[PDB]
Design a binder for this molecule. Structure first.
Ligand SMILES: [Mg+2]
Ligand SMILES: [Mg+2]
Ligand SMILES: [Mg+2]
Ligand SMILES: [Mg+2]
Lengths: 282, 282, 282, 282, 282, 282
């Protein structure tokens, strides 16, 4: 049959920005249908409510098997509000956030919602003297490349593909809701990379990515001297740029061996697989 | 004065992906309020329709000073549908798209619509054999790095920022709507780069992102032999990855001359500017 | 048997610069003898004729099995004159040219001439303000790498050596003359690369090289505003530099797989073959 | 007035391959007229003689102010033969060779001819097991990039341009004939590079290119064990590839400072000069 | 007056490997005289005791003005014995260590010892399965590149140069001994880089280097699973390799601005200074 | 049985800096015990003698099985005094040096001393106007990287490990002492690289490094003009930097084939071996 879900996006995150598209890359999955609503970058308690009310507003006629909320710091005012509104609705919800979301990690099991906490999806150096729109874009391009090439996006894809199957089974229980925490070590469980050094390079990429957070936090919430915080947050961007280079390096190693894992979606939604370039998705 | 807008996102394009965030990079603007709605990757006449209705729906109470529709190919069934829906509504609308929209450029002005066509925002190789979620994301990472580091996003931002000023003047006419077609030569009319070699590299990056389109189509809708179109779409990706490298290069040149242009928004919406890293934006 | 030929070089084309040397790379080939005549970069109607005359003059005593004319744009005043002069001669001939020669592909087949059209051998951005002597050399370096590392030169070689064999059968008929149009898609129907990704990188590299031509054309003829054509002709050169680096990346990929295809000429003229580095060519 | 000269090319050398073209880059120099003749790669005493015989043969009606012979090792059988025939003609000649030509350096002062010996124009790894047509082209592309970007070609261009002036004065005396030896230290008497590190990098690139010859020679003429000579010549080619990278790196520094030295020819033949990209050749 | 000191090296740290050499880079200083002793890489109490006793026996007749002990973890048993032994002597002493030394910072002050703790001097992935002699050297090469190119070594050089001047006046009090903790933020207050982006890339390099320590600790002392720790320590090395490239990029930015800081020693000990390449130090 | 040795370090050489460490990479060997003494960068006769006397004085109660002296030029005055002193003692001794040691090769054999001369271990551009501490450290970082990644250090490790086993049997004869001369060709007959291009790239790195010596020598002892020798020595440092990148390139190829050789020491001193990342050493 056909499964449906709603995506609410407040504020920006590398994972939230891509989460719904990781489910139907070519737009040929006839077995799903999604809606996307949000308040852009804004994520204060007010805008959040309005967004979740905009999702509950259309879920009435849309009737989503599950709703997903994606944004930074799920333990902050704005996002906290939205955890409430979704925990108390006739819809199974999933909250996708970053590392600060480990604070309210217990509280999320309580509210009965699923979650995808990406640690390497670090906050960017948000300081007016440094972060303008373009810098903002450049940083996201480097983070997108590290989360994709290291195989973290695969984890999110497969997590929302294993749910979309239980959604067609007309049985979405809280035991079916994912409870994930993505980090460098997560790659130690997969078989993503055939070349071991590629895994080690992807691991290093994610380690660096996770570290970008502390640098951005310090420069934005701790250092108050212009002469010190501008360079600090900028150094957080230089780090992520390198993590992106490491990610690319990992991918190229897999190209040298012709083992680049590829798992596309069949028109009916079933996840295929392949390693060799001219292999034809199995 | 507080301007309002509604972004309709159907299908995916690099420009539509970040278009709204380019207007409030740090979420500190208190002169704007946005509501984003879309049907994700799917952009057929059915989904597109439901999305615009969804946007017009909330537009009654939101009261946007304008509505923006972004997605690939404005000449396609769905986009054309949305193009007539917005033209017939009492809302000043803008259409953001790729090269394929040119076929309906003279047609959009008659509908009284504003448009911004980004030629280098090329369609990716959407073959099930090559394009899986990861690959799609990686593709957009490079495409984003391109549109950002080459100055194209600052063009989009500039156009909308000037529009948001008009939206405050309580007067948005067909003359105040943007009618731009971005391409490699668009940089010739700007002073984005201080280093002349940074610009020509930037131009090369956009010229190459532009050619990527021909290959993606030649392998998605033209060629039908399995043994040819897979290598064809993958070759379009390699082109995008190197285009992104030329963009990174150009920016590193602006970094060596400490002439990296940054144009961040003040809390009141005012667009500041600076070249030197240590200088505050004025 | 010892085949012979006379290459006429008028103008500058990457394929005409190497054409004869790809036939006797180590100069230890004793089954062939060549004579090279030309008037340097000048390819005007006068110089072109004075060149073909020298070739026809030398051919009297030399007595070649065929005569090759290499230079840019066979459909120009100079090349056209030479195209006709050779057709009227008693000597078989082949025309080495770029994309601009396709205009006269049908005509050359009528004149009974043979031809090899290399689409990716793009014209350089010749605009006094940019293309000085050094820059010209530089551009030709990148292009030489692209045509060499992608496999285009091996296609040229396999065609000219297949002809020299028929030239030993002292009977070269128009049916034995080459009629090739090299471009990105040529690699698709070959086995140059053992590594798949090295192939699509080579294909990506060839597409870019081809696309440089239009850029150089736009800036050398169409655009007449100095403030714009200087940047444009330079952007085309930054593009070919990228194409060269891409070709290099492809060769290194073959190296990681110890599969660099090498096909050297034995002292007798036979084309040997090898993959593995320490493997003898047979 | 108008100056003329003939160029004989036997065997290949990076400088011998570009020599003529470095004097008329766009082919719009009306004050010169060149002719090019040779036997391709072959350079044995027989082929050489037939080549210098074909140059003197056309020099009858062409009446050249000076003839130039270019090819590897001007102290070998073939080339030595050509020094004889040119020293014994009514035409002033210039011998273009590589480092092995310093052996017959004094003997050439005696024969009364000029010479340009480029030390960094190293011999390649000419072994059947390594050097095929493709590899041979890859090497010349690297060599071409270093000879150009390091500013060596500029030295050769200036030399033949200072001669083409004294050739319009119909006074080509042996004193006006060039007696040059070019190597790493040539850059110390130049102004080629404004950035001191770009010069330093170029010096290193030349030093390495020069040292490549010693490796090639060993692998080709000294090491007789196939298991050792193949890797040796192959390493000589890896060295040249990095030299090309260093040269390129020097050029990029110059772009960074907007000081890329350009010396294009004026339509009448006088060498112009400029630094800034948009400066307009003066 | 000649300044005398004894350096003791037990175990290995980047900073301790180069500490004494940074004080006499050309070996032409006439104001210093050094003795270096140690037990190589072994830093257990037994060996460290022999090392210090070796130094104290030498001090008898050599009469140094100060003694330096350098090696990892000032808090470990072996280094602790050295601190105890040095604290009990009459010779002013300094402890060079890494992050773990912070645990005994209070103890060192109470012991009258000086110290320089370099946090970016990270412990390597010391697991037999991954660290052999060559990998150990590779890591050191990268670490050295990071500490030198970021400017950390100039901080250490600086500290000791002042201590040496005071020694020449036989007046080294406990309050003269350095108490430095070096890390990413140390660079914020140095006039090391003229290019702001070079400082930011360098800060990024030091941040990543510091991060390496944590990753090496996890793989060597926490994770006990062979399958998990081998990849973890190898990823630690990948991070250091990338940190080295950042330091290298910063160094190349200074070169582009012909602003690389050099502070060589004059024959009489005076520390000169310069920026421009051809500028003489003073 | 535990082997004991003393290492004497005077002056600085890449190999003398790492020698002892390569023998106990993780400090977990039970079969060895070393003592290190030296006079830092100073290697004049007075200092060298003071150093050797320190060693021989320790030797009395330490009872070393063999003594190693490492540092620049075994033929210089200082090093020569060391050779005379050690050749005059009862302790078997090995001299670690650079190319200039070849001069006293016969003299060393007549003295009953062993030797390992590392030709690529080149002297740096030791000119005050260029070489300050930071640059000295950066040069050694690249040289170390070269000596490690190319396998030169593995050769050094092997020579000493063999000598160590002999020591454990109290049987070190003058015929057991090494007489090695390491250079580019040394790599031709080792098992180091599985990939041939990695071996080739490693050879290229050694050739360039070996060549760096001559450039530094020219700039330090021959050229006397500040305006010539500054750029000269600096170009020696740019060469080394590229030799390091080639060594890194060779290492990355091995990683692509998961054939990176690692020969770690077992606790009992046994030299293990492995190739595959996940493969345990045996
Ligand atoms: Mg005291
Ligand atoms: Mg006390
Ligand atoms: Mg003895
Ligand atoms: Mg004896």
């Amino acid at each position: 049959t056909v499964a449906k879900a709603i995506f609410i996006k407040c504020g920006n995150l590398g994972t939230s920005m891509m989460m719904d598209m990781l489910l139907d890359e070519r737009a040929d999955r006839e077995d799903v249908e999604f809606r996307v609503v949000g308040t852009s970058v804004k994520m204060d308690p007010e805008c959040v409510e309005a967004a979740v009310e905009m999702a509950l507003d259309i879920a009435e006629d849309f009737e989503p098997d599950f709703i997903v909320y994606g944004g930074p710091n799920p333990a902050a005012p704005g996002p906290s509000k939205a955890r409430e509104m979704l925990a108390d609705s006739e819809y199974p919800a999933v909250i996708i956030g970053d590392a600060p979301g480990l604070k309210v990690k217990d509280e999320m099991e309580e509210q009965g919602l699923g979650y995808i906490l990406v640690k390497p999806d670090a906050m960017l150096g948000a300081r007016r003297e440094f972060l303008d729109p373009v810098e903002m874009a450049i940083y996201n391009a480097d983070l997108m490349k590290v989360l994709a090439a290291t195989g973290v996006f695969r984890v999110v894809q497969e997590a929302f593909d294993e749910l979309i199957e239980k959604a067609k089974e007309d049985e979405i229980s809280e035991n079916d809701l994912p409870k994930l925490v993505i980090d460098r070590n997560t790659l130690l469980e997969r078989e993503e990379f055939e070349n071991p050094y590629a895994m080690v390079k992807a691991m290093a990429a994610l380690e660096i990515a996770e570290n970008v957070a502390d640098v951005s936090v310090e420069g934005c919430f701790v250092e108050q001297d212009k002469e010190r915080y501008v360079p600090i947050v900028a150094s957080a961007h230089e780090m992520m740029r390198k993590a992106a280079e490491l990610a690319d390096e990992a991918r190229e190693l897999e190209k040298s061996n012709d083992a680049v894992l590829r798992t596309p979606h069949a028109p009916d939604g079933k996840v295929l697989s392949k390693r060799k370039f001219m292999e034809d998705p199995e």
